[PDB]
Amino acid sequence: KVFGRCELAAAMKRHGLDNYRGYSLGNWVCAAKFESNFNTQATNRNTDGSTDYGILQINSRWWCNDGRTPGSRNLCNIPCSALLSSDITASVNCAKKIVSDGNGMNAWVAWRNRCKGTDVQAWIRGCRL
Ligand SMILES: [Cl-]
């Protein structure tokens, strides 16, 4: 599913991501924009052989099981395919664990490089929330 901007903002808010670990909704929407262009089915292979899945490009090295990432963990206790669903519950629940891991949203390199410190409120402008 390719979400609309405000559609994703609303779904993220419904799932409790708004101000989760102190990160406003705009931060989460910005991260999803640059990780996946709001596409739940986005996948990308990393240099180390791990793969990133879903709207927030969650990595199989630590967070989910894809059966092909040696020595990896599955800390969200989910198949990576769950992160590709039109229903964002699995991505959101796993993102909550990731953002709580110690480094906040810096875990998402694209957030650090493209969202952090910017006017992230623009990402939820116009949205009925
Ligand atoms: Cl990740």
PDB file of C-alpha atoms and ligand atoms in Angstrom:
ATOM      1  CA  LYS A   1       0.000   0.000   0.000  1.00  0.00           C
ATOM      2  CA  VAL A   2       1.227   3.485  -0.843  1.00  0.00           C
ATOM      3  CA  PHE A   3      -0.149   5.790   1.847  1.00  0.00           C
ATOM      4  CA  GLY A   4      -1.050   9.405   1.318  1.00  0.00           C
ATOM      5  CA  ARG A   5       0.901  11.830   3.513  1.00  0.00           C
ATOM      6  CA  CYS A   6      -1.997  12.797   5.801  1.00  0.00           C
ATOM      7  CA  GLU A   7      -3.387   9.250   5.624  1.00  0.00           C
ATOM      8  CA  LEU A   8      -0.138   7.910   7.077  1.00  0.00           C
ATOM      9  CA  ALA A   9       0.056  10.668   9.676  1.00  0.00           C
ATOM     10  CA  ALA A  10      -3.419   9.678  10.875  1.00  0.00           C
ATOM     11  CA  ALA A  11      -2.613   5.953  10.895  1.00  0.00           C
ATOM     12  CA  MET A  12       0.580   6.583  12.850  1.00  0.00           C
ATOM     13  CA  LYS A  13      -1.322   8.714  15.381  1.00  0.00           C
ATOM     14  CA  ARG A  14      -4.014   6.055  15.782  1.00  0.00           C
ATOM     15  CA  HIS A  15      -1.251   3.533  16.517  1.00  0.00           C
ATOM     16  CA  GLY A  16       0.287   5.785  19.207  1.00  0.00           C
ATOM     17  CA  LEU A  17       3.411   7.042  17.438  1.00  0.00           C
ATOM     18  CA  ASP A  18       2.618  10.720  17.901  1.00  0.00           C
ATOM     19  CA  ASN A  19       5.137  12.007  20.474  1.00  0.00           C
ATOM     20  CA  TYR A  20       6.337   8.455  21.174  1.00  0.00           C
ATOM     21  CA  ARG A  21       9.700   8.760  22.976  1.00  0.00           C
ATOM     22  CA  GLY A  22       9.261  12.494  22.492  1.00  0.00           C
ATOM     23  CA  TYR A  23       9.226  12.364  18.687  1.00  0.00           C
ATOM     24  CA  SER A  24       6.434  14.405  17.153  1.00  0.00           C
ATOM     25  CA  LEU A  25       4.269  12.970  14.394  1.00  0.00           C
ATOM     26  CA  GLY A  26       6.096  15.045  11.756  1.00  0.00           C
ATOM     27  CA  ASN A  27       9.341  13.262  12.570  1.00  0.00           C
ATOM     28  CA  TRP A  28       7.744   9.889  11.907  1.00  0.00           C
ATOM     29  CA  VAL A  29       6.106  10.997   8.663  1.00  0.00           C
ATOM     30  CA  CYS A  30       9.368  12.566   7.480  1.00  0.00           C
ATOM     31  CA  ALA A  31      11.268   9.370   8.260  1.00  0.00           C
ATOM     32  CA  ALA A  32       8.731   7.260   6.378  1.00  0.00           C
ATOM     33  CA  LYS A  33       8.865   9.612   3.391  1.00  0.00           C
ATOM     34  CA  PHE A  34      12.575   9.192   2.932  1.00  0.00           C
ATOM     35  CA  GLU A  35      12.797   5.540   3.975  1.00  0.00           C
ATOM     36  CA  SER A  36       9.973   4.241   1.751  1.00  0.00           C
ATOM     37  CA  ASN A  37       8.118   7.075   0.021  1.00  0.00           C
ATOM     38  CA  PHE A  38       5.154   5.874   2.123  1.00  0.00           C
ATOM     39  CA  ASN A  39       5.168   2.440   0.424  1.00  0.00           C
ATOM     40  CA  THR A  40       4.551  -0.460   2.825  1.00  0.00           C
ATOM     41  CA  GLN A  41       6.025  -2.911   0.299  1.00  0.00           C
ATOM     42  CA  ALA A  42       9.436  -1.203   0.051  1.00  0.00           C
ATOM     43  CA  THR A  43      12.456  -3.505   0.483  1.00  0.00           C
ATOM     44  CA  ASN A  44      16.153  -2.771   0.162  1.00  0.00           C
ATOM     45  CA  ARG A  45      19.148  -5.039   0.477  1.00  0.00           C
ATOM     46  CA  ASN A  46      22.042  -3.830   2.639  1.00  0.00           C
ATOM     47  CA  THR A  47      25.751  -4.365   1.918  1.00  0.00           C
ATOM     48  CA  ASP A  48      26.015  -6.877   4.774  1.00  0.00           C
ATOM     49  CA  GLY A  49      23.266  -9.105   3.304  1.00  0.00           C
ATOM     50  CA  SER A  50      20.522  -7.927   5.664  1.00  0.00           C
ATOM     51  CA  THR A  51      17.347  -6.377   4.201  1.00  0.00           C
ATOM     52  CA  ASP A  52      15.209  -3.360   5.198  1.00  0.00           C
ATOM     53  CA  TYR A  53      11.426  -3.782   5.115  1.00  0.00           C
ATOM     54  CA  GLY A  54       8.350  -1.583   5.002  1.00  0.00           C
ATOM     55  CA  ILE A  55       7.412   2.044   5.589  1.00  0.00           C
ATOM     56  CA  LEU A  56      10.246   2.572   8.064  1.00  0.00           C
ATOM     57  CA  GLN A  57      12.767   0.233   6.422  1.00  0.00           C
ATOM     58  CA  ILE A  58      13.296  -1.971   9.477  1.00  0.00           C
ATOM     59  CA  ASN A  59      16.382  -4.184   9.241  1.00  0.00           C
ATOM     60  CA  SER A  60      16.546  -7.970   9.458  1.00  0.00           C
ATOM     61  CA  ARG A  61      19.976  -7.789  11.204  1.00  0.00           C
ATOM     62  CA  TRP A  62      18.234  -7.098  14.523  1.00  0.00           C
ATOM     63  CA  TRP A  63      14.508  -6.675  14.295  1.00  0.00           C
ATOM     64  CA  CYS A  64      12.710  -9.260  12.206  1.00  0.00           C
ATOM     65  CA  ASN A  65      13.204 -12.740  10.760  1.00  0.00           C
ATOM     66  CA  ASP A  66      13.618 -13.246   7.013  1.00  0.00           C
ATOM     67  CA  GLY A  67      15.464 -16.588   7.127  1.00  0.00           C
ATOM     68  CA  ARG A  68      18.444 -15.254   5.143  1.00  0.00           C
ATOM     69  CA  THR A  69      20.382 -12.940   7.465  1.00  0.00           C
ATOM     70  CA  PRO A  70      23.105 -15.024   9.200  1.00  0.00           C
ATOM     71  CA  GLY A  71      23.803 -14.365  12.870  1.00  0.00           C
ATOM     72  CA  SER A  72      20.920 -11.901  13.004  1.00  0.00           C
ATOM     73  CA  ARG A  73      18.283 -11.457  15.680  1.00  0.00           C
ATOM     74  CA  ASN A  74      14.490 -11.036  15.598  1.00  0.00           C
ATOM     75  CA  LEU A  75      13.869  -8.622  18.479  1.00  0.00           C
ATOM     76  CA  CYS A  76      10.388  -7.614  17.310  1.00  0.00           C
ATOM     77  CA  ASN A  77       9.481 -11.323  17.114  1.00  0.00           C
ATOM     78  CA  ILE A  78       7.947 -11.076  13.649  1.00  0.00           C
ATOM     79  CA  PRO A  79       8.524 -12.294  10.137  1.00  0.00           C
ATOM     80  CA  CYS A  80       9.943  -9.441   8.092  1.00  0.00           C
ATOM     81  CA  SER A  81       7.052  -9.928   5.681  1.00  0.00           C
ATOM     82  CA  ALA A  82       4.728  -8.580   8.405  1.00  0.00           C
ATOM     83  CA  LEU A  83       6.440  -5.243   7.873  1.00  0.00           C
ATOM     84  CA  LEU A  84       5.135  -5.135   4.271  1.00  0.00           C
ATOM     85  CA  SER A  85       1.427  -5.295   5.162  1.00  0.00           C
ATOM     86  CA  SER A  86      -1.124  -2.616   4.266  1.00  0.00           C
ATOM     87  CA  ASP A  87      -1.827  -2.655   8.045  1.00  0.00           C
ATOM     88  CA  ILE A  88       1.013  -0.703   9.702  1.00  0.00           C
ATOM     89  CA  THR A  89       0.584  -2.248  13.185  1.00  0.00           C
ATOM     90  CA  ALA A  90       3.665  -4.489  12.965  1.00  0.00           C
ATOM     91  CA  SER A  91       5.857  -1.675  11.599  1.00  0.00           C
ATOM     92  CA  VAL A  92       4.677   0.724  14.301  1.00  0.00           C
ATOM     93  CA  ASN A  93       5.117  -1.747  17.182  1.00  0.00           C
ATOM     94  CA  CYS A  94       8.583  -2.626  15.984  1.00  0.00           C
ATOM     95  CA  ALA A  95       9.504   1.055  15.439  1.00  0.00           C
ATOM     96  CA  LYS A  96       8.538   1.696  19.068  1.00  0.00           C
ATOM     97  CA  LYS A  97      11.090  -0.887  20.184  1.00  0.00           C
ATOM     98  CA  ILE A  98      13.766   0.504  17.835  1.00  0.00           C
ATOM     99  CA  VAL A  99      13.322   4.120  18.907  1.00  0.00           C
ATOM    100  CA  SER A 100      13.592   2.979  22.545  1.00  0.00           C
ATOM    101  CA  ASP A 101      16.938   1.186  21.940  1.00  0.00           C
ATOM    102  CA  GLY A 102      19.107   4.125  23.124  1.00  0.00           C
ATOM    103  CA  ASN A 103      19.793   6.338  20.091  1.00  0.00           C
ATOM    104  CA  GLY A 104      16.258   7.559  19.482  1.00  0.00           C
ATOM    105  CA  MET A 105      15.416   8.230  15.864  1.00  0.00           C
ATOM    106  CA  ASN A 106      19.110   8.295  14.881  1.00  0.00           C
ATOM    107  CA  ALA A 107      18.582   4.551  14.326  1.00  0.00           C
ATOM    108  CA  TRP A 108      17.108   5.683  10.992  1.00  0.00           C
ATOM    109  CA  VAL A 109      20.082   7.148   9.166  1.00  0.00           C
ATOM    110  CA  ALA A 110      17.749   8.921   6.704  1.00  0.00           C
ATOM    111  CA  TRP A 111      15.955  10.570   9.613  1.00  0.00           C
ATOM    112  CA  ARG A 112      19.259  11.870  10.946  1.00  0.00           C
ATOM    113  CA  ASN A 113      20.400  13.050   7.534  1.00  0.00           C
ATOM    114  CA  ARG A 114      17.151  14.467   6.107  1.00  0.00           C
ATOM    115  CA  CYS A 115      14.671  15.133   8.935  1.00  0.00           C
ATOM    116  CA  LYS A 116      16.542  15.827  12.156  1.00  0.00           C
ATOM    117  CA  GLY A 117      16.548  19.544  12.976  1.00  0.00           C
ATOM    118  CA  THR A 118      14.274  20.502  10.056  1.00  0.00           C
ATOM    119  CA  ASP A 119      10.728  21.897  10.131  1.00  0.00           C
ATOM    120  CA  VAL A 120       9.197  18.432  10.454  1.00  0.00           C
ATOM    121  CA  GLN A 121       5.803  19.960  11.369  1.00  0.00           C
ATOM    122  CA  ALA A 122       5.420  20.669   7.629  1.00  0.00           C
ATOM    123  CA  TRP A 123       4.867  16.927   7.128  1.00  0.00           C
ATOM    124  CA  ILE A 124       1.529  17.055   8.976  1.00  0.00           C
ATOM    125  CA  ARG A 125       0.412  20.483   7.676  1.00  0.00           C
ATOM    126  CA  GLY A 126      -3.177  20.521   6.410  1.00  0.00           C
ATOM    127  CA  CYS A 127      -3.918  17.122   7.933  1.00  0.00           C
ATOM    128  CA  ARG A 128      -7.092  16.512   9.904  1.00  0.00           C
ATOM    129  CA  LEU A 129      -5.562  14.943  13.021  1.00  0.00           C
TER     130      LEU A 129
HETATM  131 CL    CL B   1      16.293  -0.871  11.257  1.00  0.00          CL
END
